Amino acid sequence: AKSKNHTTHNQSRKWHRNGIKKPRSQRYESLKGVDPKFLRNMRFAKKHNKKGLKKMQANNAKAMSARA
Amino acid sequence: VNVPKTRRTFCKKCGKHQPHKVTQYKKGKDSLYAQGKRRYDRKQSGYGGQTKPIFRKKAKTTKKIVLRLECVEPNCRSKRMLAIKRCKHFELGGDKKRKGQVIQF
Amino acid sequence: RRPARCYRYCKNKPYPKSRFCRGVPDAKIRIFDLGRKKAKVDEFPLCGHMVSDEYEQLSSEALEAARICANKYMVKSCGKDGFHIRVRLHPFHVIRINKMLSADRLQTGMRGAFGKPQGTVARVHIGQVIMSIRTKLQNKEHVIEALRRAKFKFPGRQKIHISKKWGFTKFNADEFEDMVAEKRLIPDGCGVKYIPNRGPLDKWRALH
Amino acid sequence: TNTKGKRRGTRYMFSRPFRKHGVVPLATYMRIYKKGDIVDIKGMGTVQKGMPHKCYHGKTGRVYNVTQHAVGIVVNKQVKGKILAKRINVRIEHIKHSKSRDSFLKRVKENDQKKKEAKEKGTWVQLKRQPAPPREAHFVRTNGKEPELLEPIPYEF
RNA sequence: GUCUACGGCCAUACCACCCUGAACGCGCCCGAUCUCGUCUGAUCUCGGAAGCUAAGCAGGGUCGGGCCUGGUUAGUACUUGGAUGGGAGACCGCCUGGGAAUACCGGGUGCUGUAGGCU
RNA sequence: UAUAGGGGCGAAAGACUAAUCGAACCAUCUAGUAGCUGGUUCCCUCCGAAGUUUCCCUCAGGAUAGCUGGCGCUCUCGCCCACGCAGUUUUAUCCGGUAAAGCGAAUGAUUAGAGGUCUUGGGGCCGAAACGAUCUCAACCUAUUCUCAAACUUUAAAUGGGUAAGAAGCCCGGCUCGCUGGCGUGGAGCCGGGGUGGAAUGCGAGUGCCUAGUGGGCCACUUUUGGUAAGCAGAACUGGC
RNA sequence: AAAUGGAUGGCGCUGGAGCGUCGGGCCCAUACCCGGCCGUCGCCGGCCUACGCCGCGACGAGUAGGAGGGCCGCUGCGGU
RNA sequence: CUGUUUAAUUAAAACAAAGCAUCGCGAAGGCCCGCGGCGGGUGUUGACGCGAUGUGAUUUCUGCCCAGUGCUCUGAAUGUCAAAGUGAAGAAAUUCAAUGAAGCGCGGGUAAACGGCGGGAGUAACUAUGACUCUCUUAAGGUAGCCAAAUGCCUCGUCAU
RNA sequence: GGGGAGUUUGACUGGGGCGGUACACCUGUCAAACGGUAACGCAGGUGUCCUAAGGCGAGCUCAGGGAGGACAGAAACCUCCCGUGGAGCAGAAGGGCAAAAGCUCGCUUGAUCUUGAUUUUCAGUACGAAUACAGACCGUGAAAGCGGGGCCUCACGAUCCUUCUGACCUUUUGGGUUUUAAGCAGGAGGUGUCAGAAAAGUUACCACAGGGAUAACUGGCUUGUGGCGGCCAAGCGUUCAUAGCGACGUCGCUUUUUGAUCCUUCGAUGUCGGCUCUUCCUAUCAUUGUGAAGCAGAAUUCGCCAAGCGUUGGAUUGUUC
RNA sequence: GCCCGGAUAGCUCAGUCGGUAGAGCAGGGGAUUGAAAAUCCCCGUGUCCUUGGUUCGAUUCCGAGUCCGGGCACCA
Numbered sequence A: 001a002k003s004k005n006h007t008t009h010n011q012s013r014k015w016h017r018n019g020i021k022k023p024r025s026q027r028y029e030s031l032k033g034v035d036p037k038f039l040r041n042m043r044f045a046k047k048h049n050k051k052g053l054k055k056m057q058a059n060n061a062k063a064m065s066a067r068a
Numbered sequence B: 001v002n003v004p005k006t007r008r009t010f011c012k013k014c015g016k017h018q019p020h021k022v023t024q025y026k027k028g029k030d031s032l033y034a035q036g037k038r039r040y041d042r043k044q045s046g047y048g049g050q051t052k053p054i055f056r057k058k059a060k061t062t063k064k065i066v067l068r069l070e071c072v073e074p075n076c077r078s079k080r081m082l083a084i085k086r087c088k089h090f091e092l093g094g095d096k097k098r099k100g101q102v103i104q105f
Numbered sequence C: 001r002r003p004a005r006c007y008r009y010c011k012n013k014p015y016p017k018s019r020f021c022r023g024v025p026d027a028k029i030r031i032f033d034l035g036r037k038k039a040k041v042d043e044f045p046l047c048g049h050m051v052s053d054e055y056e057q058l059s060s061e062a063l064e065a066a067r068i069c070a071n072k073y074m075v076k077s078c079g080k081d082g083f084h085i086r087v088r089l090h091p092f093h094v095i096r097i098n099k100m101l102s103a104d105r106l107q108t109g110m111r112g113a114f115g116k117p118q119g120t121v122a123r124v125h126i127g128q129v130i131m132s133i134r135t136k137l138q139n140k141e142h143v144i145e146a147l148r149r150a151k152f153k154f155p156g157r158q159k160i161h162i163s164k165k166w167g168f169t170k171f172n173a174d175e176f177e178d179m180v181a182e183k184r185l186i187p188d189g190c191g192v193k194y195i196p197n198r199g200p201l202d203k204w205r206a207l208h
Numbered sequence D: 001t002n003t004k005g006k007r008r009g010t011r012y013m014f015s016r017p018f019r020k021h022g023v024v025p026l027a028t029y030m031r032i033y034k035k036g037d038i039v040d041i042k043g044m045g046t047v048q049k050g051m052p053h054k055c056y057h058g059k060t061g062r063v064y065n066v067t068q069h070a071v072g073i074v075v076n077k078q079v080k081g082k083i084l085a086k087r088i089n090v091r092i093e094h095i096k097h098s099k100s101r102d103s104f105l106k107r108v109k110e111n112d113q114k115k116k117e118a119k120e121k122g123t124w125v126q127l128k129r130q131p132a133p134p135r136e137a138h139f140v141r142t143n144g145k146e147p148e149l150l151e152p153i154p155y156e157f
Numbered sequence E: 001g002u003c004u005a006c007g008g009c010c011a012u013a014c015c016a017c018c019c020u021g022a023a024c025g026c027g028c029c030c031g032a033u034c035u036c037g038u039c040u041g042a043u044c045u046c047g048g049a050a051g052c053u054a055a056g057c058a059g060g061g062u063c064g065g066g067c068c069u070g071g072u073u074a075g076u077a078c079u080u081g082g083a084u085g086g087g088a089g090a091c092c093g094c095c096u097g098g099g100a101a102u103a104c105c106g107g108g109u110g111c112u113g114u115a116g117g118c119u
Numbered sequence F: 001u002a003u004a005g006g007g008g009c010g011a012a013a014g015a016c017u018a019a020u021c022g023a024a025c026c027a028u029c030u031a032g033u034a035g036c037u038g039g040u041u042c043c044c045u046c047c048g049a050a051g052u053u054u055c056c057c058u059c060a061g062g063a064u065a066g067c068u069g070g071c072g073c074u075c076u077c078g079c080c081c082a083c084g085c086a087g088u089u090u091u092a093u094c095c096g097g098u099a100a101a102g103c104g105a106a107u108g109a110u111u112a113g114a115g116g117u118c119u120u121g122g123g124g125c126c127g128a129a130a131c132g133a134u135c136u137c138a139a140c141c142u143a144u145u146c147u148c149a150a151a152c153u154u155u156a157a158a159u160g161g162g163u164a165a166g167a168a169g170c171c172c173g174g175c176u177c178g179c180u181g182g183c184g185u186g187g188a189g190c191c192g193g194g195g196u197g198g199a200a201u202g203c204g205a206g207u208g209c210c211u212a213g214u215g216g217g218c219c220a221c222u223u224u225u226g227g228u229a230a231g232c233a234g235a236a237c238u239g240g241c
Numbered sequence G: 001a002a003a004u005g006g007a008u009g010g011c012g013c014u015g016g017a018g019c020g021u022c023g024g025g026c027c028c029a030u031a032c033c034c035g036g037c038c039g040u041c042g043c044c045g046g047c048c049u050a051c052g053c054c055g056c057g058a059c060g061a062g063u064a065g066g067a068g069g070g071c072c073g074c075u076g077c078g079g080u
Numbered sequence H: 001c002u003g004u005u006u007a008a009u010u011a012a013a014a015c016a017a018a019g020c021a022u023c024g025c026g027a028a029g030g031c032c033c034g035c036g037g038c039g040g041g042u043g044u045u046g047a048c049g050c051g052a053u054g055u056g057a058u059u060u061c062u063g064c065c066c067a068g069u070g071c072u073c074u075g076a077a078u079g080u081c082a083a084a085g086u087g088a089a090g091a092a093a094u095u096c097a098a099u100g101a102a103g104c105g106c107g108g109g110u111a112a113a114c115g116g117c118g119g120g121a122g123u124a125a126c127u128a129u130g131a132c133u134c135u136c137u138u139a140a141g142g143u144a145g146c147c148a149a150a151u152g153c154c155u156c157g158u159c160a161u
Numbered sequence I: 001g002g003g004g005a006g007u008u009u010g011a012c013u014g015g016g017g018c019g020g021u022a023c024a025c026c027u028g029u030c031a032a033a034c035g036g037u038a039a040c041g042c043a044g045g046u047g048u049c050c051u052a053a054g055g056c057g058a059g060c061u062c063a064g065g066g067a068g069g070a071c072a073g074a075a076a077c078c079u080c081c082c083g084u085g086g087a088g089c090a091g092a093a094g095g096g097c098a099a100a101a102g103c104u105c106g107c108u109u110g111a112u113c114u115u116g117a118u119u120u121u122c123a124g125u126a127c128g129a130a131u132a133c134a135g136a137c138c139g140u141g142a143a144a145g146c147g148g149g150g151c152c153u154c155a156c157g158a159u160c161c162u163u164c165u166g167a168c169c170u171u172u173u174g175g176g177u178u179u180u181a182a183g184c185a186g187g188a189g190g191u192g193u194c195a196g197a198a199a200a201g202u203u204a205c206c207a208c209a210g211g212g213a214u215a216a217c218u219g220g221c222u223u224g225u226g227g228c229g230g231c232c233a234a235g236c237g238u239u240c241a242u243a244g245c246g247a248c249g250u251c252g253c254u255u256u257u258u259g260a261u262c263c264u265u266c267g268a269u270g271u272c273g274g275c276u277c278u279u280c281c282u283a284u285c286a287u288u289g290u291g292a293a294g295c296a297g298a299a300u301u302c303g304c305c306a307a308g309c310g311u312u313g314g315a316u317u318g319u320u321c
Numbered sequence J: 001g002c003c004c005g006g007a008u009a010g011c012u013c014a015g016u017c018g019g020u021a022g023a024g025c026a027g028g029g030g031a032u033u034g035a036a037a038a039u040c041c042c043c044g045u046g047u048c049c050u051u052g053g054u055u056c057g058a059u060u061c062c063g064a065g066u067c068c069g070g071g072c073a074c075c076a
């Protein structure tokens, strides 16, 4: 009662049927796992961007449109 | 192994390192009128013999050692348990060694 | 003693007498030089050696029989101390025996099948010298006849060459006497010490 | 049955090679790792805290995270039927930059300068990389001497 | 053409021995009352400056040892792929491409950054 | 006439008990159970495998991945240049410690000669004896020499493995930050603006669900482990059956 | 040198029908090419059962298995 | 010995058997059956009986072990000790303690109860063999007898016929 | 309390049993220069040990050798010089380490509490181990920092149930108070068949479903072992290598010994030996024809063509022998 | 062939608790007896089988051999 124990034959020819493609990798990669201190920085950074970035950036857009 | 008697360690009640009495854990006398014990006697009564399996093949000859800790400060009195690795031989708190010693065997 | 037909062509990896074997018996050969061991360099100009043609194993008992046959023909042919013979090839590979009838079926099958150490063989590459006999210029036929009588006692096919080199050293016999006469090669027993000229000057001052 | 623990095929791979045993030189530490760099991973036996694995030796990945004294890399590792982008945390002592991306940035900057000068002066500079062309019809010289005659040599041993 | 302080590469910059060093500088050196620490002011710490380049140090040298690099080794050993190639087998030869190491021989033996100072 | 089935009877053979007995016969529970054999009924078209990973009182079996098919869906084409991809090459750039080679380079084994005079013990000789003097021996050291290594190595291939070869990229200007901090400093994010012609070759790609069968393999070149060897057992790369 | 009588396949074959080196012709597979026919697939076209009709081009092996079509078939039921 | 047995493969050396032993029991008992009752059987019986075994005529014999394993006798002798009962704490559920039937362990007997019964070293005026002597050792170390047998591997043991 | 009843009797496996654990977890190698990759392959380990052998800081440098010094000797103590790991780091090896990860000393508990992410095994599940952080509260150091066990790779364990700890926690069923019980969160009590059933034996009185996935008999490949040969020639042979033999070695053949393997048959190929009977082989015992001898004759021995024809009667043992 | 159990004065043998070499017997020495045994008073006797690791130390704890000694070697 003895059988062939382990092999890796006929494995590459199975793997390359559908193809060994890459893992997609879309834009704006997943941001979990990054440094919590940096993340606590960047969240308040974003919400205060969206808070105070109206007036002076609108001024600078008017200024750069007047220049060009 | 060998642990000391007093050992300043964090206790969660008063949020600081406080000194602790360190004693040996006792398993505690198991009690009748618990849930599993009442279920075990309810299923054990009647003509059924041994329902739940009793254990035979004990292989681990060592037991993990856990320590009872007490905050030495009055009216805090927080107890908690902490584990060490396995050991065959254990002493509580005495006989620390020296390196300038002659044996005399 | 199993027949040497099976212990032949180099199949398994080299397995030396070492830390991991620990039970191999002694090799058959123990000495390696038979002639005038203390011969100086110019006492024997030529050498004839024996080139292997095949890639195979040679057993220590075969080397033992071959050096004895060549020794006996030399001392009958050109007298004692008229030759210096050297077996350049040493046995270090250790062969294995998984012996049975240890007559019935009932001991074991092929279950525990890593054999015990049988003995020692010597691995040969193609073009490697087995024996080298350094003799006088007059002894050219005796060397050929001796290595012919050893050729039958080794297995396989291998040929016999008469070297271009002086002595056992690696220098040409034509350049040898012309170059030892003045400058470089100082004789050292049976060996020859080469000198470069990129040394400290104490060597050149100790010379001349 | 090959005793599948960490770091088993590494009698040679995590070794400091030769005449280089000792303290780590500090130019490995004093480098700047920004998010988006491309780094090589190479094992160092002297610093035993944050060695990656025996799998990721020589693999080249992307940096996405920076901490006090380590760095998090994304590395394409092949497993059985598909390749995956994993996320490793490696200390700084095992890491160096790939020079490939810096060479490509030099290519990009030369291409931008040639593009600006070409739009300036109307020249068509052909700023792509052409592969090795066949040899042009050159014109050899045999002055003074007939060509040397070669023949196969007679065998000796 | 140099040194000091901090360095980067980490022996082309080590090791052995022999020469030379003007000015600053580093030292060697003279002493323990405070700071200090020892069995011991030898080491560590502290107040200096009578001497000295003898040593470290710095430069040079050794048909120097080592290192680095380049030839020879050698298209040799090996090797991806191929053949209704040879061979009883062992292995070997060929087409296709790639291609190494020791003895042997020749050459070198620190280069630099920042701040500071002497000719 | 008595003894009736886990019962009877047996001068004991586990024999006999209606041709059945190491637990009789008949009916019912009952279409009991089975990872185990056997069979499993019309045509044509299209696509088309696996005998492998892990876990299991698992090793003739199942679950799990992988392979397959069906159902689609979301985009791309048609009217000096595209999106994306690749069992491929090139151009760069890293990585390895095998083939080979090496021992006058560490470790491990190992052959032989020569030189030297410290150290002894041992032989001989001058001698009452004396490192008093001398010859010899071994050991030792010095440069040499022959051969090696799956559990040695300075060196070190060919084949190979990863990454890159651009608009998700450059470059400019500004806002925000409780993070960092000599510094309006660093780093991220956000906004607005500016210029796509960035190796070779080939192609349509991306994505979701459901799930059958499979979980007994074998051979061939080459590399390889055990064995004397095998049409033997066991592996690797590729192909085939 | 091996047990029934037998195997370069046999018959045979020696200026070859043997060995090695080669040449010029010649034979043929479902391979290739050309041409016809069937089906699948794709790309369409027409305001002609639109579930039909033609057109173009590339391809068709196959067990375990999976789908699609069948104006294939047996027996019965409502409608015709 | 006569006898009997596996009908349908065995006829025996097996089985029984007389003889020899051994053990329980004085009827409110032994040994059994029975779902049940003082219901049956031995029993219409009473130790020259009934019940349960071992061995197997006569003749001659019945060795040595109570360590193991059984069996049995003994005493609340004293450790272990289950319900119920007692006492205590508690609002109560509950908890604790003391007391402690059989049995187990402690002690005595039994082998015609199951069963078991050693190995070394030296040693005699030719050599061998060795009565004797010393030592470890178990509870006891195979005694009377008997044999290569139906039991002896080596084995076709050695000698005689 | 086997008088009676029910049930169990691991798995791997060059057949099974016996033997072993290759049944969990580590090191080197096989491993074919990324990773992965097997056998009852090799060479080994583990079911621990540590109040320090952990953490930090400071000082110092080891093994070994040479040279010297009362008792001192091969080995006691001291001092100098050389000393790139030849030592030590708890342990099996490998890696790594020299103003150190080693030795000594001073402080000490970071071997503490808590959420996550990721690696490792991998199905991209878990336990275990580990990495990098985050927030407390600390130790150390002048400070930079280091530290959340052991310089790194092994040292360990689910559900259920018990047990202990934590909150002025929840529910304890018509509403209250208290006991008790249940619950949340995290530690231990074990599953070594180590991702975890609670488990003895025998069948020769056996039964059933199956397997040639799997032994005993033949057949086939193989030839160690058995048997039969060949080459070389140290010798033996009164002298003399080869009339006859021939060691030390060496290359083959045979399937009449035994072994290895499991390819065929487990819905059956009737298994030893003997009796009888036919045919074939030659590696020739005798006969025909020959050659050589250490062949005087005789009697022998060794070769060649040669299987035509012979190769018996008995005591024993079932025998082949 | 596996699998266990060993080795110690001249001989039987213990002691192992990693730090001790011990009993009995034999040999040797006296006394006692005319003289032998026996007795009484004493002695000496070991590489703790060999080669290696851990330890501060190996007669002992392990690793490897030597020479012994038990047990298994079954279905067919």
Ligand SMILES: [Mg+2]
Pocket: A003, A004
């Ligand atoms: Mg299988």
Ligand SMILES: [Mg+2]
Pocket: B046, B047
């Ligand atoms: Mg009850």
Ligand SMILES: [Mg+2]
Pocket: C003
């Ligand atoms: Mg033979």
Ligand SMILES: [Mg+2]
Pocket: E032
């Ligand atoms: Mg003072």
Ligand SMILES: [Mg+2]
Pocket: E037
């Ligand atoms: Mg002081």
Ligand SMILES: [Mg+2]
Pocket: none
């Ligand atoms: Mg001073």
Ligand SMILES: [Mg+2]
Pocket: E053, E055, E056
């Ligand atoms: Mg000086």
Ligand SMILES: [Mg+2]
Pocket: none
């Ligand atoms: Mg000077």
Ligand SMILES: [Mg+2]
Pocket: none
């Ligand atoms: Mg030089």
Ligand SMILES: [Mg+2]
Pocket: none
């Ligand atoms: Mg210099």
Ligand SMILES: [Mg+2]
Pocket: F006, F023
């Ligand atoms: Mg019944």
Ligand SMILES: [Mg+2]
Pocket: none
């Ligand atoms: Mg009947």
Ligand SMILES: [Mg+2]
Pocket: F031
């Ligand atoms: Mg049915």
Ligand SMILES: [Mg+2]
Pocket: none
């Ligand atoms: Mg049925």
Ligand SMILES: [Mg+2]
Pocket: F059
């Ligand atoms: Mg399975």
Ligand SMILES: [Mg+2]
Pocket: none
């Ligand atoms: Mg699909």
